[PDB]
Design a protein around this ligand. Structure first.
Ligand SMILES: CN(C)[C@H]1CN(Cc2c(F)cccc2Br)C[C@@H]1c1cn(C)c2ccccc12
Length: 358
């Protein structure tokens, strides 16, 4: 990777999120979204490092602060869609072509820290909230499928979550120091998703009933000793970090325990490795993976990028490379790889954007 360009957004506030559109069409240039202040902005990557500015959506409320975005597509037309959310607790579904807000969702209206789309179903959107819950939405029928909470759920803000490969289960994490597993391939949840697709408020009198899921299928506070701010599945293993200068690779149970035989009472975890780094001990810093999960990237609080090659026989054998530029000194909140892994974008606390090309 070589640094080929940079720019800075005019708001001078932190850029909290960046996502390439991995649903961009064949023959179209690569496009990424950034979120910060009260806006979302799209850019196109071109030759000679060119980052071409397209168009933003700016919230009507000057005090909105977007924290997260996620791409999907319209399941009938194939056109890409962009979901954004943040401090107002409003999910907006944006048409990236025109930057129109197509529709919006409100749960209880508390800050949303992360959005993720289901890996197999483009209509299923997961939101994680400051109000300690996760919510699963069906953006085809505009239904709240399920709320994951209760006293056995998270006890402080939820900061991140991730679906597994097939979208059969979710791992969430947050300020309570815990990582929690929620299975969504239960008979109850499969039925709830089916029912959400059968719901049309114009053809019935009932409201749509959301599931209240109050018990995770596994919980641990034994991995980290502070806020857990990013989580990703790597097959049946988990990668998670806190503010302790480490990403930990771990699994529920003992070494030979199958993830789908783990019981909610399971008290053990197994640590398969740990990727240490420096100067990333402030709260709220995300890591990202490429589409194939061959690579992992994290920025630190002084503008350095760490990239790990995970194409090795065991997690602890990952190969690290570091990327620095003398003008990039602000905290990197999130990174994104293009689908082919040819471009890595980093976004920063000073509203700067950095492009690295292979
Ligand atoms: C207060 N909450 C908990 C954070 C959560 N963060 C989202 C987020 C996350 F959840 C996990 C990992 C990275 C990130 Br980025 C948005 C919020 C926030 C507001 N301001 C002004 C900030 C200033 C600096 C950093 C974060 C925030």
């Amino acid at each position: 990777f070589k640094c080929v360009n940079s720019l800075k957004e005019d708001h001078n506030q932190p850029l909290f999120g960046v996502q390439f559109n991995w649903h961009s069409k064949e023959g179209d240039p690569l496009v990424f979204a950034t979120v910060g202040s009260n806006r979302v902005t799209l850019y196109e990557c071109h030759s000679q490092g060119e980052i071409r500015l397209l168009q933003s959506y700016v919230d009507a409320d000057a005090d909105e602060n977007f924290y997260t975005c996620a791409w999907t597509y319209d399941s009938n037309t194939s056109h890409p869609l962009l979901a954004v959310a943040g401090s107002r607790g409003i999910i907006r579904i944006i048409n990236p072509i025109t930057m129109q807000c197509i529709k919006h969702y409100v749960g209880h209206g508390n800050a949303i820290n992360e959005l993720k789309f289901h890996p197999r179903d483009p209509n299923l959107l997961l939101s994680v909230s400051k109000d300690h819950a996760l919510r699963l939405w069906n953006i085809q029928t505009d239904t709240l499928v399920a709320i994951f909470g209760g006293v056995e759920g998270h006890r402080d803000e939820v900061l991140s979550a991730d679906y597994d490969l097939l979208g059969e289960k979710i791992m969430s994490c947050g300020m309570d120091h815990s990582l929690k597993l929620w299975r969504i391939n239960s008979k109850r949840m499969m039925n709830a998703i089916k029912e959400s697709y059968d719901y049309n408020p114009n053809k019935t009198n009932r409201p749509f009933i959301s599931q209240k899921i109050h018990f995770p299928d596994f919980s641990t506070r034994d991995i980290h000793r502070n806020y857990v701010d990013c989580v990703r599945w790597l097959g049946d293993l988990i990668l998670s970090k806190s503010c302790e200068n480490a990403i930990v690779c771990w699994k529920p149970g003992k070494m030979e325990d199958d993830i789908d035989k783990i019981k909610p009472s399971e008290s053990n975890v197994t640590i398969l490795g740990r990727f240490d780094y420096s100067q990333c001990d402030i709260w709220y810093m995300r890591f990202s993976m490429d589409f194939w999960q061959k690579m992992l990237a994290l920025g630190n609080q002084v503008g350095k990028l760490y990239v790990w090659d995970l194409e090795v026989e065991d997690p602890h054998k990952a190969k690290c490379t570091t990327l620095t530029h003398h003008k990039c000194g602000a905290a990197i909140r999130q990174t994104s790889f293009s689908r082919d892994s040819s471009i890595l974008i980093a976004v920063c606390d000073d509203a700067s954007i950095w492009r690295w090309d292979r």
